[PDB]
Scaffold this active site. Structure first.
Site, PDB file in Angstrom:
ATOM      1  N   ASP A  44       0.816  -1.199   0.000  1.00  0.00           N
ATOM      2  CA  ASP A  44       0.000   0.000   0.000  1.00  0.00           C
ATOM      3  C   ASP A  44       0.862   1.267   0.000  1.00  0.00           C
ATOM      4  O   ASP A  44       1.564   1.571   0.974  1.00  0.00           O
ATOM      5  CB  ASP A  44      -1.095  -0.002   1.114  1.00  0.00           C
ATOM      6  CG  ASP A  44      -2.024   1.203   1.083  1.00  0.00           C
ATOM      7  OD1 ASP A  44      -1.742   2.271   1.593  1.00  0.00           O
ATOM      8  OD2 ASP A  44      -3.153   0.990   0.444  1.00  0.00           O
ATOM      9  N   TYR A  49       2.998   9.970  -0.736  1.00  0.00           N
ATOM     10  CA  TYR A  49       4.066   9.382   0.085  1.00  0.00           C
ATOM     11  C   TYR A  49       5.450   9.614  -0.507  1.00  0.00           C
ATOM     12  O   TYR A  49       6.468   9.511   0.182  1.00  0.00           O
ATOM     13  CB  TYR A  49       3.876   7.883   0.405  1.00  0.00           C
ATOM     14  CG  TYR A  49       2.567   7.507   1.068  1.00  0.00           C
ATOM     15  CD1 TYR A  49       1.759   8.445   1.712  1.00  0.00           C
ATOM     16  CD2 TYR A  49       2.152   6.176   1.063  1.00  0.00           C
ATOM     17  CE1 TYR A  49       0.558   8.065   2.319  1.00  0.00           C
ATOM     18  CE2 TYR A  49       0.953   5.779   1.656  1.00  0.00           C
ATOM     19  CZ  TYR A  49       0.153   6.733   2.287  1.00  0.00           C
ATOM     20  OH  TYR A  49      -1.038   6.370   2.869  1.00  0.00           O
ATOM     21  N   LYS A  74      -2.575   5.917  -4.655  1.00  0.00           N
ATOM     22  CA  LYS A  74      -3.710   6.813  -4.494  1.00  0.00           C
ATOM     23  C   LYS A  74      -3.554   8.136  -5.196  1.00  0.00           C
ATOM     24  O   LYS A  74      -2.437   8.637  -5.369  1.00  0.00           O
ATOM     25  CB  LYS A  74      -3.955   7.068  -3.020  1.00  0.00           C
ATOM     26  CG  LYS A  74      -3.622   5.863  -2.155  1.00  0.00           C
ATOM     27  CD  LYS A  74      -4.199   5.974  -0.749  1.00  0.00           C
ATOM     28  CE  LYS A  74      -3.842   4.789   0.133  1.00  0.00           C
ATOM     29  NZ  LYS A  74      -2.436   4.796   0.557  1.00  0.00           N
TER      30      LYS A  74
HETATM   31  N1  LIG Z   1      -5.987   6.721   3.503  1.00  0.00           N
HETATM   32  C1  LIG Z   1      -5.189   7.486   4.274  1.00  0.00           C
HETATM   33  O1  LIG Z   1      -5.312   8.701   4.396  1.00  0.00           O
HETATM   34  C2  LIG Z   1      -4.094   6.775   5.083  1.00  0.00           C
HETATM   35  C3  LIG Z   1      -3.602   7.437   6.219  1.00  0.00           C
HETATM   36  C4  LIG Z   1      -2.604   6.806   6.988  1.00  0.00           C
HETATM   37  C5  LIG Z   1      -2.145   5.539   6.581  1.00  0.00           C
HETATM   38  N2  LIG Z   1      -2.607   4.881   5.488  1.00  0.00           N
HETATM   39  C6  LIG Z   1      -2.012   3.533   5.265  1.00  0.00           C
HETATM   40  O2  LIG Z   1      -2.268   2.704   6.406  1.00  0.00           O
HETATM   41  C7  LIG Z   1      -1.034   2.095   6.880  1.00  0.00           C
HETATM   42  C8  LIG Z   1      -1.063   1.817   8.409  1.00  0.00           C
HETATM   43  O3  LIG Z   1      -1.359   2.987   9.268  1.00  0.00           O
HETATM   44  P1  LIG Z   1      -0.309   3.769  10.046  1.00  0.00           P
HETATM   45  O4  LIG Z   1       1.057   3.271   9.699  1.00  0.00           O
HETATM   46  O5  LIG Z   1      -0.557   5.216   9.793  1.00  0.00           O
HETATM   47  O6  LIG Z   1      -0.642   3.478  11.657  1.00  0.00           O
HETATM   48  P2  LIG Z   1      -0.639   2.186  12.455  1.00  0.00           P
HETATM   49  O7  LIG Z   1      -1.908   2.062  13.200  1.00  0.00           O
HETATM   50  O8  LIG Z   1      -0.267   1.042  11.567  1.00  0.00           O
HETATM   51  O9  LIG Z   1       0.466   2.413  13.438  1.00  0.00           O
HETATM   52  C9  LIG Z   1       1.795   2.429  12.950  1.00  0.00           C
HETATM   53  C10 LIG Z   1       2.804   2.266  14.064  1.00  0.00           C
HETATM   54  O10 LIG Z   1       2.547   1.026  14.760  1.00  0.00           O
HETATM   55  C11 LIG Z   1       3.746   0.306  14.941  1.00  0.00           C
HETATM   56  N3  LIG Z   1       3.497  -1.082  14.626  1.00  0.00           N
HETATM   57  C12 LIG Z   1       3.245  -1.931  13.590  1.00  0.00           C
HETATM   58  N4  LIG Z   1       3.204  -3.187  13.944  1.00  0.00           N
HETATM   59  C13 LIG Z   1       3.467  -3.154  15.301  1.00  0.00           C
HETATM   60  C14 LIG Z   1       3.571  -4.164  16.263  1.00  0.00           C
HETATM   61  N5  LIG Z   1       3.403  -5.465  15.980  1.00  0.00           N
HETATM   62  N6  LIG Z   1       3.850  -3.791  17.530  1.00  0.00           N
HETATM   63  C15 LIG Z   1       4.023  -2.488  17.799  1.00  0.00           C
HETATM   64  N7  LIG Z   1       3.956  -1.449  16.973  1.00  0.00           N
HETATM   65  C16 LIG Z   1       3.673  -1.859  15.731  1.00  0.00           C
HETATM   66  C17 LIG Z   1       4.796   0.873  13.996  1.00  0.00           C
HETATM   67  O11 LIG Z   1       6.049   0.946  14.645  1.00  0.00           O
HETATM   68  C18 LIG Z   1       4.253   2.237  13.584  1.00  0.00           C
HETATM   69  O12 LIG Z   1       4.993   3.304  14.171  1.00  0.00           O
HETATM   70  C19 LIG Z   1       0.079   3.002   6.360  1.00  0.00           C
HETATM   71  O13 LIG Z   1       1.285   2.267   6.170  1.00  0.00           O
HETATM   72  C20 LIG Z   1      -0.488   3.534   5.029  1.00  0.00           C
HETATM   73  O14 LIG Z   1      -0.114   2.753   3.883  1.00  0.00           O
HETATM   74  C21 LIG Z   1      -3.588   5.509   4.743  1.00  0.00           C
END
Ligand SMILES: NC(=O)c1ccc[n+]([C@@H]2O[C@H](COP(=O)([O-])OP(=O)(O)OC[C@H]3O[C@@H](n4cnc5c(N)ncnc54)[C@H](O)[C@@H]3O)[C@@H](O)[C@H]2O)c1
Length: 277
Positions: A44, A49, A74
């Site tokens: 994704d 990005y 996107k």
């Molecule tokens: N449509 C949108 O506007 C939008 C916005 C934000 C993100 N996204 C997508 O969604 C994805 C995921 O969301 P996100 O990264 O913003 O937040 P998230 O809820 O995935 O949180 C990310 C954080 O959680 C931690 N993480 C991941 N696995 C973990 C684990 N097992 N234990 C502890 N911490 C862990 C990471 O270190 C990271 O800092 C992004 O990679 C992106 O591709 C889309």
């Protein structure tokens, strides 16, 4: 093994993927190569990005068959107008060095600009041209969705929105189920913005299965039928996040996690569609 779910358009998508949001562009290639190695197949990304190149580079580097991968990119807020959508997608394609993407999304609705319908129309044309396999939106509220569908007669395959235990956007998810639109949970783990892993419903479920809280949370999204692609650079979390098809939560467990939502929107951790561009 990561199971897939089937879209309203018949295309399938791996239920768990690797989101590269926040990954610095200069590090995206390594990150993706690692996910890839770990067994991740759904990537994704997004034009905003600024790391599509890295993804593309990682893909090419992997010997991986195109068909075995699920690539999502996107459409940025400033490319809603005229034929900008086609220009934007072509740029993205060039960066990824792909013929086409699996799924393409309208990043934000930018309601105030009143160009999300036009964006949607153009998206349909992108799919027709084969630039992308499926189309969806992101951060679209119920009215946004009604409007685009009403205007086009074409229903988004997905709606990627902020979703985690404290902020579920039930109205959207409900609307989606009624319209057969799949839900992609962004910020599935709260982006670390709050003590989610400390939540008791979370600890109880994880412990109850010999899993981590992160894992239990991920399982909940999955069980609710949503698509997840949590971000992470630590291989420990990569492997860990992949290890969630092995178990399942009880209804009681799920129900307990569902109660975490205040129901007043106060659990939100990110930007609201009415506020972004
Ligand atoms: N449509 C949108 O506007 C939008 C916005 C934000 C993100 N996204 C997508 O969604 C994805 C995921 O969301 P996100 O990264 O913003 O937040 P998230 O809820 O995935 O949180 C990310 C954080 O959680 C931690 N993480 C991941 N696995 C973990 C684990 N097992 N234990 C502890 N911490 C862990 C990471 O270190 C990271 O800092 C992004 O990679 C992106 O591709 C889309």
């Amino acid at each position: 093994t990561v199971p897939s779910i089937v879209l309203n358009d018949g295309n399938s998508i791996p239920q768990l993927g690797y989101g590269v949001y926040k990954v610095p562009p200069a590090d995206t290639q390594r990150a993706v190569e690692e996910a890839l190695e770990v067994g991740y197949r759904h990537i994704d990304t997004a034009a905003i990005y600024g790391n599509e190149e890295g993804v593309g580079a990682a893909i090419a580097a992997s010997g991986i068959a195109r068909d075995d991968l699920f690539i999502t990119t996107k459409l940025w807020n400033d490319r809603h107008d005229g034929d900008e959508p086609a220009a934007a997608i072509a740029e993205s394609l060039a960066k990824l060095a792909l013929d086409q993407v699996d799924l393409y999304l309208v990043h934000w609705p930018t309601p105030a600009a009143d160009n999300y319908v036009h964006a949607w129309e153009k998206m349909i044309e992108l799919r027709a041209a084969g630039l992308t396999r499926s189309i969806g939106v992101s951060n679209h509220l119920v009215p946004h969705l009604e409007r685009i569908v009403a205007a086009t007669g074409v229903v988004p395959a997905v709606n990627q929105i902020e979703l985690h235990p404290a902020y579920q956007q039930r109205e959207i998810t409900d609307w989606a189920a009624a319209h057969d639109v799949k839900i992609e949970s962004w910020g599935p783990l709260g982006q670390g913005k709050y003590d989610l892993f400390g939540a008791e419903p979370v600890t109880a479920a994880a412990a109850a299965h010999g899993k981590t809280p992160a894992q239990a949370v991920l399982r909940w999204h999955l069980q609710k039928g949503f698509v997840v692609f949590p971000g992470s650079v630590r291989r420990e979390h990569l492997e860990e996040n992949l290890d969630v098809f092995d178990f399942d939560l009880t209804d009681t467990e799920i129900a307990a996690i569902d109660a975490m939502d205040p129901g007043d929107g106060s659990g939100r951790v990110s930007g609201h569609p009415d506020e972004v561009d």
